Design a protein around this nucleic acid. Structure first.
Lengths: 148, 51, 203, 193, 99
RNA sequence: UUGACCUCAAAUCAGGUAGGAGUACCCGCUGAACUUAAGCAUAUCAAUAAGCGGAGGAAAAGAAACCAACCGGGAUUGCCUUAGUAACGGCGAGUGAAGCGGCAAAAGCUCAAAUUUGAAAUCUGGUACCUUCGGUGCCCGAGUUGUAAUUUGGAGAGGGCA
RNA sequence: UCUUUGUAAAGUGCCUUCGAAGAGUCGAGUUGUUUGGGAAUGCAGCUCUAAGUGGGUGGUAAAUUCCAUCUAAAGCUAAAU
């Protein structure tokens, strides 16, 4: 709030913390990102490299739905099952009742493989999977099949 | 014959010819109107006649 | 129905018969006034589909509007400003000649609402429109509530506001991604997307 | 006018935004007015539920097709399957959509079941006589909440086949990428013997 | 066609059992009624041919279909506009040549 | 000669109607420049201010010649998001939406294209009466170059059959 | 209350014949403006100017071949604002 701002400590000091020689002016360097190629080149080319240019292709009418693909790692995979029944599922690890996890209904598009899923069989439902994720799922004894 | 604008009946002779109904371009829409108890008629037809 | 034949036959605007009719009609439209009442529509089929019913209360004016662009009214053709606006010739009016015709007819007969208007003919330096007018203060049209919506005070001078078929076209009020800027009024959308919507609890 | 390690802040205020700022002090006021409007509409049209019955439909796009939501209205095919007429449904308080089409059985089954359990849960006063004293409920949507479909069992047996799911995905993707060239080459062989 | 039941591919999409709903009377706005064909046949007989249309008849019947097809695309809007017009004029030439 | 009709007139004709004010908001048209770009011309300010025209309590838009590419949604409007993103731009300065999603509110329809053809079944106006934001009777007109009923694509019409 | 109000209308299931649906308009070219809309977003001027299983849209211009979704060139309508 105002009573703590240092302008209150600046009452009585003539230049108000802006220098006598500099004489704080209204717009000394231009306005906005002005002069990014002429006199602010060093600042732009030292702290924001790659600012100027046309890299890549122009995507017309980009809908973020097409690229909607939230990531899910195998370690985070077990968090989808509710807590009350997670404990009974890690124990009694059995092929004939393997928990099925609707990662898509949970809001995850792809299954990634950060790793170390325990040796229990889990049926994984997802839009996409990766080489290592499916290998580890098989290594745990479970299976992954795709949905849409 | 004096239908204004003329395109209202411009196709009637063609339409009559294709269907084969006899047609007569009579002089005066007022005559047609006065045989139908109106101001003008611009067209008149008989579909049935006493014996 | 004759109007089905009339509509298709009036579509052939370059046939010999249609050319002869428009040759004769453009002349006697020209020797009459710029704005003059037509005693009956010269395109009854077009008037019928645009809502003209041959009952007393409906009015048909014929209006003659100058062709060509709009020359910007600056003296000596000198527009003082940046060169991107120095252009005084070649500037195109944003309202169709149909819309200009409806406006001049409406301001001539201010006691009528402009139902619609339609191209009737055209020559080198004029365009010709028959403007469908409906009298809101005639008891015939006040009754028959199929048409009593136009005597509602919100519909007076709908051509000046741009509410007829041409007005909708000029403003680009159409459904589609082609009209994302102009869907409910480009000034409303512009104001909609330039407002700073601040809340009680800032977001 | 630019210095230090600060991100480039794209602020769109070169325009005279000050005349066009709209601050919503009336957020509390409009909420009270809206609740009053709901109160007066309910008092006006009592005892009908103050709102229509919306069908449960699947959301579009690949992102949201995992959630059902209240659509606009029941398609005419759903209304007749419930044994009604579109006009009659509108009067008794069923939202009807004429431009939506039913192409999914599961969605269609839910909606006709939604209508059937709506009819059995409403009562309609006769036009003539003493209408029975009914208590006004204020939310048809709440009385018939939108339900997520039950996908499958919580835990079932492993139906393994060694399909190598990822290899299927590459195979399907490669076929889609190369469908044209494999067809065109087959076409050239077929036309040139 | 039925979907493949996976998130990518030619027929990506969930397995559903469909309807094939009752066709809308729409999608038939372009369908030519019996009376409508009669009306347009009458108009062509009585109105005749438009100026460029006669030139196209001359061009298609003397120079060649391809060289008339290009000028129709210029004269009319686009290629498919020219395609429909040219195929029409071959029919009118055949109809007017016969009998 | 006399009646029409068509068009065009006049009337201190009978009955009406428009103008102007206000303009905070709204609908269009026209439309700058200062400014920014550390210069300046494209750009920006801005599809803004000023000018003009036109309404209401709201107006506009509005029931897809839509969005999508999905297990599809379903008039319009507004808010949160999308998103300071796709994209535009001396690709410089800067500019920059929309679909989906949640919510508020939700309401759908009407003409023209059909012959009633076994009967213009329609409507204004004058006049008389009355229970008068009007009704009835009679009359003059308008109207067949088309007024009512019927259909508006979701359909619907006609013809039987119960 | 009804001599006002049933030579009444409305809804519904078959089968059949159909099923008309908007032109200087869409669209194309060029010009100017405008847009985030980029081989051209929209509008406007001029020239050209259609079809009816057609037409429009499907955010890269064009041709070939399909699919998907709507039905323009006529109109009205409360609320949320």
């Amino acid at each position: 709030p105002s009573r703590f701002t240092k302008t209150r400590k600046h009452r009585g000091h003539v230049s108000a913390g802006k220098g006598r020689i500099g004489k704080h002016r209204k717009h000394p360097g231009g306005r906005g990102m002005a002069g990014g190629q002429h006199h602010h080149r060093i600042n732009m080319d030292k702290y924001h490299p790659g600012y100027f240019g046309k890299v890549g292709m122009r995507y017309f009418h980009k809908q973020q739905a097409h690229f909607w693909k939230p990531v899910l790692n195998l370690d985070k995979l077990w968090t989808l099952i509710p807590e009350d029944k997670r404990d009974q599922y890690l124990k009694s690890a059995s092929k004939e009742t393997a928990p099925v996890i609707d990662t898509l209904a949970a809001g995850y598009g792809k299954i990634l493989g950060k790793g170390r899923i325990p040796n229990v069989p889990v049926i994984v439902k997802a839009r996409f999977v990766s080489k290592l994720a499916e290998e580890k799922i098989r290594a745990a004894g479970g299976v992954v099949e795709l949905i849409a | 014959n004096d239908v204004d604008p003329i395109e209202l009946v411009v196709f009637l002779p063609a339409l009559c010819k294709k269907m084969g109904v006899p047609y007569a371009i009579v002089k005066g829409k007022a005559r047609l109107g006065t045989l139908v108890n109106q101001k003008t008629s611009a067209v008149a037809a008989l579909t049935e006649v006493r014996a | 129905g004759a109007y089905k034949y009339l509509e298709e036959l009036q579509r052939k605007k370059q046939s010999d018969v249609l050319r002869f009719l428009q040759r004769v009609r453009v002349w006697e439209y020209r020797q009459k006034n710029v704005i003059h009442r037509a005693a009956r529509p010269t395109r009854p089929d077009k008037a019928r589909r645009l809502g003209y019913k041959a009952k007393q209360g409906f009015v048909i004016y014929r209006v003659r509007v100058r062709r060509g662009n709009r020359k910007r009214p600056v003296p000596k053709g000198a527009t003082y400003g940046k060169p991107t606006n120095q252009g005084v010739n070649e500037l195109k009016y944003q309202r169709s000649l149909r819309a200009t015709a409806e406006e001049r007819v409406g301001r001539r007969a201010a006691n009528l609402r402009v139902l619609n208007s339609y191209w009737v003919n055209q020559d080198s330096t004029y365009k010709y429109f028959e403007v469908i007018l409906v009298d809101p203060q005639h008891k015939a049209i006040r009754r028959d509530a199929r048409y009593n919506w136009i005597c509602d005070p919100v519909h007076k001078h709908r051509e000046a506001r741009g509410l007829t078929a041409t007005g909708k076209k000029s403003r680009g009020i159409n459904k589609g991604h082609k009209f994302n800027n102009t869907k409910a009024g480009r000034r409303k959308t512009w104001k909609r997307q330039n407002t700073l919507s601040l809340w009680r609890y800032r977001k | 006018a630019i210095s230090k390690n600060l991100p480039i802040l794209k602020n769109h205020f070169r325009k005279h935004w000050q005349e066009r700022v709209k601050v919503h002090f009336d957020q509390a006021g409009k909420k009270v007015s809206r609740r009053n409007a709901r109160a007066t509409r309910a008092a006006k049209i009592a005892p009908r539920p103050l709102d229509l019955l919306r069908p449960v439909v699947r959301a579009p796009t690949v992102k949201y097709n995992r959630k059902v939501r209240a659509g606009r209205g029941f398609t005419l095919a759903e209304v007749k399957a419930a044994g009604l007429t579109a006009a009659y449904a509108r009067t008794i308080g069923i939202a009807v959509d004429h431009r939506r089409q039913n192409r999914n059985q599961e969605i269609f089954d839910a909606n006709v079941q939604r209508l059937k359990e709506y009819q059995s849960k409403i009562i309609v006063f006769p036009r003539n006589g003493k209408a029975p004293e009914a208590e006004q409920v204020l939310s048809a949507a709440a009385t018939f909440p939108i339900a997520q479909p039950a996908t499958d069992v919580e835990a079932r047996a492993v139906q393994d086949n060694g399909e190598s799911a990822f290899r299927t995905l590459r195979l399907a993707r490669s076929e889609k990428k190369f469908r044209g060239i494999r067809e065109k080459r087959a076409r050239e062989k077929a036309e040139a013997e | 066609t039925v979907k493949t039941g996976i998130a990518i591919g030619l027929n990506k999409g969930k397995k559903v059992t469909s309807m094939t709903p009752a066709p809308k009377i729409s999608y038939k706005k372009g369908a030519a009624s019996n009376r409508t064909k009669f009306v347009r046949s009458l108009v062509r007989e009585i109105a005749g041919l438009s100026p460029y249309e006669r030139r196209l008849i001359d061009l298609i019947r003397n120079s060649g279909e391809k060289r008339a097809r290009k000028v129709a695309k210029k004269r009319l809007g686009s290629f498919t506009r020219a395609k429909a017009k040219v195929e029409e004029m071959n029919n009118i030439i055949a109809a007017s040549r016969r009998h």
